[PDB]
Amino acid sequence: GFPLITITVRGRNVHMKQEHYMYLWHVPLTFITSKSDMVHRFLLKTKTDVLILPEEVEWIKFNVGMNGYYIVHYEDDGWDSLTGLLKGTHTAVSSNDRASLINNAFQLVSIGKLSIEKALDLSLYLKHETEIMPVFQGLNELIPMYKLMEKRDMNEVETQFKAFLIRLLRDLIDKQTWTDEGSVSERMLRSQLLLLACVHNYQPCVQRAEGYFRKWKESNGNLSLPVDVTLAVFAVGAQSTEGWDFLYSKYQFSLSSTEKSQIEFALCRTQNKEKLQWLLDESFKGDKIKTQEFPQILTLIGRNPVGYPLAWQFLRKNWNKLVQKFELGSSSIAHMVMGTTNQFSTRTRLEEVKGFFSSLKENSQLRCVQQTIETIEENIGWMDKNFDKIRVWLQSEKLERMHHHHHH
């Protein structure tokens, strides 16, 4: 793994600890503070050391001058100080600094040094966030949590989780234009935001999506849709049979591969089980859809909240043919093993997976089988510890917005 730096503030005394998480080096640290101007530097040569600030401070923010991944942990007191800072003047640290805070808080939950409650409390600052990185870093931590819940019996918490997500980003979603203007960033922010809104059934997005789809479809796809809006439009269009079939017709006749890829995604997101089975059957066959696309499709259906048992079944039933087609040690096979199983989080699923792959003999030894089993094992541990916590944190924050003592 990687360097983990623990920062502890004791009045004007800053204590710094280094460890390699998962022995010692000269850690080049930088930091600013609520009093600071510029960036201060400190070379940490020992296990722990202390520097002295000229004045007590309200928050401190460290970086490590290195390429690659590391974590800075500030402990309960320091994580609250940074939380208050992000909720008060988030721009006091840079766009990349805020993505780091988000990433590190949540990874510190998997590690067990920060509670999920504190990390979720940090995530609430996002309601003021506007920059792509912290936003996408937010999505990168939070989505995996409900992907896990989608494969269990947790409909009530999952929907409360998803509405929490949409609430964080709702103002930013309402600000987007349904156009192609802006920088590379703004177009990508737009495009992924509108999609996310529609996947979670945020009505103003969904209904504007349905209107664009209808207009596109009535034109025989002759009207040009803005490109940044098309995944969202396609994804809602594909929710009905008429629109799915229409979209499937166009996939056939299209000579634009970014269209074909957009449509491919939209077709895989339907709730209709017979369509999902068809996509798998036809892509596997290789004539209506290229078999080249099959590992991608299997994976996308593996992630559909309703297609996930079809994907793991299909992989198990057709294994000998999938191997003939793609080859045992291929990246295609590893991608497929991982995308149909790495979001399971129960012992039963784990025994299923171990059962199936240990029953293959010299067809069992693949490293992707060990790596999915590891991740499932982490999933089990993370969900058993955190699900009840998240459940109570969500109901308790929905209650507090209705009434809280600050309302007096």
Swiss-Prot record:
- Chain positions carrying an annotated carbohydrate: 222, 363
Bridged cysteine pairs (disulfide):
198-205
Q: What induces it?
A: By IFNG/IFN-gamma.
What is the tissue specificity?
Ubiquitous.
Subcellular locations according to the entry: Endoplasmic reticulum membrane
Q: Which protein family is named in the record?
A: Belongs to the peptidase M1 family.
- Subunit arrangement? Monomer. May also exist as a heterodimer; with ERAP2. Interacts with RBMX.
- Briefly, what is this protein's role? Aminopeptidase that plays a central role in peptide trimming, a step required for the generation of most HLA class I-binding peptides. Peptide trimming is essential to customize longer precursor peptides to fit them to the correct length required for presentation on MHC class I molecules. Strongly prefers substrates 9-16 residues long. Rapidly degrades 13-mer to a 9-mer and then stops. Preferentially hydrolyzes the residue Leu and peptides with a hydrophobic C-terminus, while it has weak activity toward peptides with charged C-terminus. May play a role in the inactivation of peptide hormones.
* Name recorded for this polypeptide: Endoplasmic reticulum aminopeptidase 1
Gene source species: Homo sapiens
Could you tell me the gene encoding this protein? ERAP1
